[PDB]
Structures are given as C-alpha cells and as structure tokens.
Design a binder for these strands. Sequence first.
RNA 1: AAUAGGGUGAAGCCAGAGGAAACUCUGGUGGAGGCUCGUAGCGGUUCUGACGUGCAAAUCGAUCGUCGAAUUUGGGUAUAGG
RNA 2: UAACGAGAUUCCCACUGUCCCUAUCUACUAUCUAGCGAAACCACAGCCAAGGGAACGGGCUUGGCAGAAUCAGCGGGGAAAG
RNA 3: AUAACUGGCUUGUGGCAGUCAAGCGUUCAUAGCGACAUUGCUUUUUGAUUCUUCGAUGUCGGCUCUUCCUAUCAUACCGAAGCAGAAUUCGGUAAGCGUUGGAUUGUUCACCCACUAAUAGGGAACGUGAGCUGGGUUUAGACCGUCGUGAGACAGGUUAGUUUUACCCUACUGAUGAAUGUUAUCGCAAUAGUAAUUGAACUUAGUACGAGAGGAACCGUUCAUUCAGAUAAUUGGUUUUUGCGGCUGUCUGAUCAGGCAACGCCGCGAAGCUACCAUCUGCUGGAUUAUGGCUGAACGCCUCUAAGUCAGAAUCCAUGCUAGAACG
Lengths: 131, 386, 62
Amino acid sequence: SGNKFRMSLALPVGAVMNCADNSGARNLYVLAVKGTGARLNRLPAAAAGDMVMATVKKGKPELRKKVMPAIVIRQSKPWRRRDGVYLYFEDNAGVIVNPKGEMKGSAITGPVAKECADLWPRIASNSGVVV
Amino acid sequence: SHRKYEAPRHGSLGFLPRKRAAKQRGRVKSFPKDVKSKPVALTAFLGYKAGMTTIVRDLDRPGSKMHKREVVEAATVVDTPPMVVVGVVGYVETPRGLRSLTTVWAEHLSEEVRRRFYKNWYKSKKKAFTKYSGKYATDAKQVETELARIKKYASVVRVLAHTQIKKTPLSQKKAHLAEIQINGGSVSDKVDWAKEHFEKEVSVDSVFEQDEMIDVIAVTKGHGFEGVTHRWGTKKLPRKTHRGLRKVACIGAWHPANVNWTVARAGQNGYHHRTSINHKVYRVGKGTDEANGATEFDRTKKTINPMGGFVRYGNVNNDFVLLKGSIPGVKKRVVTLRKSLYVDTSRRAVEKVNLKWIDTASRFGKGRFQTPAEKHAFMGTLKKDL
Amino acid sequence: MKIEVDSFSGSKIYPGRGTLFVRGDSKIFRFQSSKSASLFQQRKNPRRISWTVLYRRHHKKG
RNA sequence: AAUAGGGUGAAGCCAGAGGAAACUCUGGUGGAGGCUCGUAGCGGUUCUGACGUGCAAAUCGAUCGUCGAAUUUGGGUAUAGG
RNA sequence: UAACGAGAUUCCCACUGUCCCUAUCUACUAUCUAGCGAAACCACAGCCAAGGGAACGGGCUUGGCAGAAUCAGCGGGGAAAG
RNA sequence: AUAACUGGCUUGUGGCAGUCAAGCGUUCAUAGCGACAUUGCUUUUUGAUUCUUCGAUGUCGGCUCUUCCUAUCAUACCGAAGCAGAAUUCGGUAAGCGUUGGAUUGUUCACCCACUAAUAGGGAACGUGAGCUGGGUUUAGACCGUCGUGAGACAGGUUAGUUUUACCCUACUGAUGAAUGUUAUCGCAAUAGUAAUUGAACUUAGUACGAGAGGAACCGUUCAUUCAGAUAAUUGGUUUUUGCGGCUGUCUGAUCAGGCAACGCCGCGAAGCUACCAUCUGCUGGAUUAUGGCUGAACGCCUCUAAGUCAGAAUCCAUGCUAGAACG
Ligand SMILES: O[C@H](c1cc(C(F)(F)F)nc2c(C(F)(F)F)cccc12)[C@@H]1CCCCN1
C-alpha cells in the first residue's frame, strides 16, 4: 500500500544483511525479492523498503532453517532521493515480518530509512530515528 | 532447436542502420500540421547546446509523494540568439509528394550567412547573391512575380532563416540556414508574414513560451567504430573464452545460409540523427537581463552562466531556452527545437513551472560557490588581493 | 532550498551536492565532495587538515 | 666437478632441583635427519594462458614440485635389433 | 592408520569483476605510411526463395531481382582447409 | 556394395485432433466428460530401410545470439457454464508482446526451493566447436568388480588425458567513391525497417452480488517491472593530468633540486569516458478479426446476411521515428 520511487538496489539474492530487531535473529540471508519480474541471468535484488524472503543464517535454532518474509530497513549502497540527496547508511539491515508487513520483534536498533518507514506503518511504529 | 531460455532482443530495429548522419544539422522530418484558424507563427527554432545545469523546483502533482515538496532536476541550457529571416519557399502538392515551386530571397544577406555557400571563403571573390541583389533594381517585379506565384500555387509555405552564430562563443563563422515551416493563416497571409520579416530578427519569445513541451532534433555524440558489447549491450562471453570475449558468439543458424540483418555486429556508434520529444521549457531567458539565473526566491543578481563559464562552451550572453532533462547532441552542436506535434493534456504537460533556484557553481570541478562575491565572503582576503 | 554545512570541511553544500552519511549510532554527517568524504572514512582529523574551517578556527587564521 | 640464506633441534655432554631407593624434573650445550621454508640447479602441476604457416618439428610467460641426497652433471667405458 | 601428497571429492571462515553488469586506464599489435615481402588454398567461379535432382544447388527450371572501383571488421555459407 | 550423425520415403510406436453416442454428470447423452468402435493429422519420440556421404559434412550437453511455427502459459477483445459475487473450467480472433533466480546431476530429461501476469510446447544439418567450453562419451596410463587358463572383454563403476588455420569469395555490420556541364545551399519521399511492455498501490468500495462466508469492475491518480533511444547537471567508477602531496631503497659530497625501482608504492585527483550504480524521453488517427447488433428477404413468420449497414482486439495501414534510391 504505497508507491515509493525507484532506488538503487543494494542486496542481490544471496546477500546476508544484519537483523536490526530483537526477534533473536542475527543474520538475514536474502533468497528472493517480492515483485521481481523476469530477466535472463539477472539476480533479484532488494533496496530499502522492499519485502524479501529470507532465512536466518545465525540465530536461535527455532528461527533457523525456515523461509520467512523480511523487510530491508537500511542499505549501504548510496541512493538518490527525488530532492537530489544521495545518502547511505553504515550497513544493510532488515527485520522479520509477516506477509502482511507486521513485525515479529518489538523494537529496532539503529536508524531506519524514510522510504521504509513511509511504506510500512508497523515498522514506523516500532522504529526510533527515521532518516 | 529452440532457445533454452527466452530473453528480449538487444537493441531496437527501428533505428537502423546505425550509420552516421548525412548532415550535422538535424533536419525537421515533419512539421506540425497546419491549422488555418491560428495566427501566423513559426514552428521551429535553431539553437546551440551550451551545457547542463541543476535547478530546484516545488512539484505540483497532486497524489504524488513529492507534491508541494522541492525536487532537484537536471536542466539543459540552449544558447539561442535571434534568427534572421532571409527567404521564403513555396511547396506544391503533387501526386508524387511535395515539390518546391520557387525560392525567393531577401535583397541583403549578412556575411555570416553568405559564408554558408562557400567551402573556401578566404580564396573567393565572394560573388554570392550579387546578381540576385541586382534583381531588386527599382521595381522588383521579378520578386513580386515570384511571390505572386507562391500565393497562387503553394500549399505549404516555409521561411528560410539562419542563426546569428557571431553572437555565440563558437569560432565557426558560417551561419546555419534552415527551412522553418510557417503555420497559421492563409497561404497569402504566410507569404505576407515572410516578406514583412525579410532581413528581420525573430526572437525565441515569439516561438516558444514557458511550460511548453517541445521537441529537440540533433545529431548525437559520435563514438566511432564500436564493438557489439557496447554498441548493442550484448552479454560478455566467459573469462576463459579463446580469441576474446567482447563478441556475439553465434551470428546465425546454418540456414538461412546468410548472416541476417537482425544480428548485432560491430560498427559505428553514435553520431546518429535523433528526434526526442516532450522536453518542458522551464525558462525562456532574456539576453539583456542581468539576472538570468535569479529567481523569485533567490534574488542574487546572477546570470545563467556557471563560474568560469560553461566548460568547453563559454558564456551564454544571449536569450536561451532552459529544457528539462537531457537532449541529444554534444556541446556546441546546433539543435533544432520544434513545437509539439500533438496536444498533451497530462498534468506533467500542463503543470506551471516556477523555479526555486538555478545552479551556477563551476562545472569544471567540485565547485562550491555560486558567485565570486560569495567566494570572497567565505574565504576572506587572499595574498593576491594585494 | 536550504544550504547545509560540510561536517568535515565546513564548506557550503548546495542542493544535490555531496553525500549524506548516517552512522551506526544514528548521527548524520554531510560531505560536500568525495575529497572530504574520503578523508573522513580515512579517519583524518579536520583539526589537523590545514584547509578545513575547523583547522582555521583552531589556529585563529583570518 | 657443483649445490645462497634461514627454521626445527636427535644422540652425547655440563650444571641445578626433588627422592629412602628405583629414579624423576628443570636450564644450557650440542648439531642429527633419504627433516623443513626457500635461491642457483633439476623437473614440468595449472592457466586446459601465449603461439599454434610459431622464436621453437615442443618454445615463451606466470604459477608450481624438489633443492644435501635413491641429488645434479662433464668426459672415458660397456651392453646392438627378436 | 599419525605424518606426508602440484592425487579425487564435500562443507565452513577470509577473499575477491567468477557473477548481478558492466565501465575505465596503460604498453604492444591491429590501423596508415617508406623499405622488405611469404604461405595454405584454387574444375570454373561466387546474390536469394521454391521446385525437381545421387532424396539439403553458385550453376538447371520458375520467380525475386540486378550499376563501376572499393576500405576496416566479421565469422552464416563455400556440406571451407588440414 | 555396409553399420554408428544429419537428411529422404514410411508413421507401426510416440504426440495431437475428429465422427457415432452406451453411460457419468441431484434430473439430463453432448456445461464438462465420454466406453465399444471408427476417420485423420504431425514429424517435436522411437522404430523400419540403407538412397547420399568412409581420398572425413568435427559425433553430447551447456554458454552466447537471431529468427520462425502455433497445437496460446500470460497479456487485448469476446462467446459458453452444473457462470449469484470472487475464483475456475470450455471455447473464438489472435504469435503483436513476454515466458525467470537457484540447490543436486556432464546430462537432454528430472526433481524440489522461490519469485512472477506467466514461469507454453517446438523448428532452423536433433540451429549454433576456423563462436567458446570440454564436465560426458570414445585412443593410448591406472584401479576395482564379474567373466576368461590366458592374452584380454564389459554397451559396468572410477581417476588423468594437445580442441589447429581466414589474409580469399559471398553474406552481414559500418566507411569512401567515377560518371551522369561544374560547384554550392536547401529540400521532396519511392522503398526498407520500426517499439514499446506488464504489474502494483490509492479511489471507485467493503460498494455491486450474496442468507452469510466472502467480494469485484469501468473513468481517474501515483508509481514500478522488462525493453528502447539519448545524456553527464548531480553521485559513483576509472587516472600517464604521472596534476599536487606523502613514503621506502639507492645514486648525484651535503642542502635545494632531481634520476632509477621493466609507469616503485600510497591519498586526493580535475578533464574525458561511463552506470537502472546516475538522470531524461518513449505519439494519435483510420480500417478490420472474433463477437454483439440494425434494416431485411429467401421461406407472407423468423432471421446480424443473401443485397446494404453499425460498433469492435495487444491485429493491420497510416501519423510519428531511422535510412534516403550512391543509375528517383
Ligand atoms: O590413435 C591415434 C590417436 C587417436 C586420437 C583420437 F582418437 F582421440 F582421435 N587422438 C590422438 C592424439 C590426440 F591428439 F591427443 F587426440 C594424439 C596422438 C594419437 C591419437 C591415431 C593413430 C593414427 C594417426 C593419428 N592418431
């Protein structure tokens, strides 16, 4: 439920990002991106605010070895906003959510991109600093 | 056998052959269709690509997430001093297409446009248009007869106009002469307008208004002979391939026992004629205005020129057109600006543009000042300042 | 449009110029160019970089 | 006839400590080995690199095995077509 | 089965243009010039579609067509060469 | 004269499609199916044959790339339902447009994970090796198992095993060019090509429909996917600007200033080039197919059809875009 402008993709399939919520996961390994069309040889890739299918590579055993949706909340690849600003974060991080976009954890450590907070109200609720 | 997997074709078959343009001046392939009820007006203009800049603008697009919020946008500056009208051509409708009936010229042509007709001007006797200038002897009935022929038989009337390239920083002395179709009014009205404008200047403000969507006709940047990988965007072959990898691996099946015209091949890249449409006019600047780059929010008395001049162009001391985005061609290229061929009622086409700020920092580096006065205020006194 | 200030060198940042850096501790740094951006990621001290505003105010120049 | 420079640190030997004894422990010294890192040398793993009417009827480049012995090599000499 | 292995294989950390997806730069070629100057190969030669045909034609039949001389590339064909 | 590829005749077998209509489908042969029979098509399977090639047509698969077929997976417009809505199934015009990222396997095939509007099937010497690669097979080394007295065999497993040449003709891609009195400028447009594509969110609307459960759509708005053509504002990349600075070894007696390290190394680095790693742009008219209609006979009624005629698809032809006939 939203229309965010195109952003430079930061996380191809196979990328491992940080897990920024208290859900108990420490890694989030991207294996697919929601909304990725067809193009030969092109890897699906995610930007901040994208829903992702991910596994927990490092974390609690009951969180490990499962496919689960996740949302990227910050990215280290610089991207341009429509106001001309190129910005980037120190790392790539995401949070575990439902298919509906509702978090599993209850807090987020670190800043959150405004594209993601503007696009996912629950992450905005559980988010602190939003840049 | 079929392809194992599908993929779209690399490149467009509608821009073949990828050869050099026959002329460097882009030619208007089609002019806007004539409506008699409109007033008599020009439909195109010739300018010179000066450079690119940056603006800040408040967006007026309801329903957008950037509505009423500032956007930073690339813009192009086109140096456009007024063109001089020197002639008029009549075209006749024939079962084989349009046919030029007669060309009538003005009595006096400037040296810059008369150099157009010479390859070695300095070695010439400069005889161009001298007998024709004598044709105006004390009654000009030959000229009146040709004009009457145009009124009687022509269905399409085009004027001949040339740029005043001496007002630009270019070292070229030849003017650029082009046919610009006249739209509006009857054929007699068009011929009268052309005659009354012989040897007269026509400014940009009489052809283009602000917020218009216009087309740009130009010859793109040349790249010379190019391989398939960059000419057509084909996939590079694996690293361990013998005899090289910037190739197309299979250029055809066994049958047809020929290479097809649709296979990507190495060849000349760039320097193509392109027509790019729907570029919005953010500003029609005036050359006499000393605050070209100033807006209603940035009251700095400031021209459009960056610090140190446009890189590899110079300063824009004339009237100019500020277009949104990028247009084909390189710096100093002559560009033909054409009015739109259709009526666009989309919100992007009908939006009224009010500029917030225009970038005039140096384009020759990471410029960080908008004005020498600002530079002096920031840095204070230097050693060279006594 | 408003003019920002380079966090490293103190130079004026005009719309679209330079980059925005968000540190892990949620602090926001603005660099007018890749020169000061590179010196910042190289951990240089602007008080010890002779052309920055911080150096010039520390040394009472101009 | 030839084979840089290092590492490791075997027997043997000196001193000290513990023990009733049988014996044990510690610090040096010493300089062994078809030991080891690595040059010249000898070889020829991979790039399935270059070249492939070649510089060359087997070479060139990087990478690599080994490098004090079952080592490398000159000359003399012996073995000759079922 | 400790040690050893330019032996075959699986996984993990580090690492990276292997890849997403490409871009840019350097020297030597290629290129153009003066001088020098080969070889493979060669029935005759050299534009296509269908037909029939030793059952996949450059030549035949029926059509499409067809305008000197050429340069750099290229690898579809000559069921190319060896 | 004769096997192992391609190709040719054939089409048993493989694949696909019809006709009849006993039955299934609460009733009800034909919404959707359809036994017993029976008529065909195809050459994407495998056989059969041995016509071409043994003074050699490089024999698997993958990568790359173009194009074609339609027996249509999606997208456009529609007809039918055991179609209330949503979903789904059957079908028509339709190949314009797309049809993916991966784990295992040398694999074709397969099988899962996941995204997606969809993850359709095929052809072009089972397309494509002077395009690559060489994992497999199928030379020579070696091991095992079974077989053999043995040398050795295995269509069984395993490991290592040189992939040569274009400078000719044509064809493709680009580039000049004699002569059509000379030269110069501005044009016309025959013909050839052609380009855009799909999705999501908001609104409509928790509305129509429905007992409820559930639950649409047109007009519109904002964005995005795949593709295309440009461009260098900005940001990023690149650095022989060897531009500025720094550092090591050595050499010029020291200093200054320099040489060399087969660009000595490092930071920044303008300019140029360049990236869905950046930004911009991608048109509107007519004629139709299926289909639904109007008037209207044949056949005093009826009937979209016979004459005439209306609307109407991602279709076609134009508009627009690219080239400009080097004998217009
Ligand atoms: O049996 C020899 C041989 C065969 C083959 C193969 F079967 F693979 F093609 N390859 C050979 C090779 C090869 F190049 F490694 F393939 C080298 C030497 C002899 C070979 C023959 C003997 C006649 C002369 C040519 N080589």
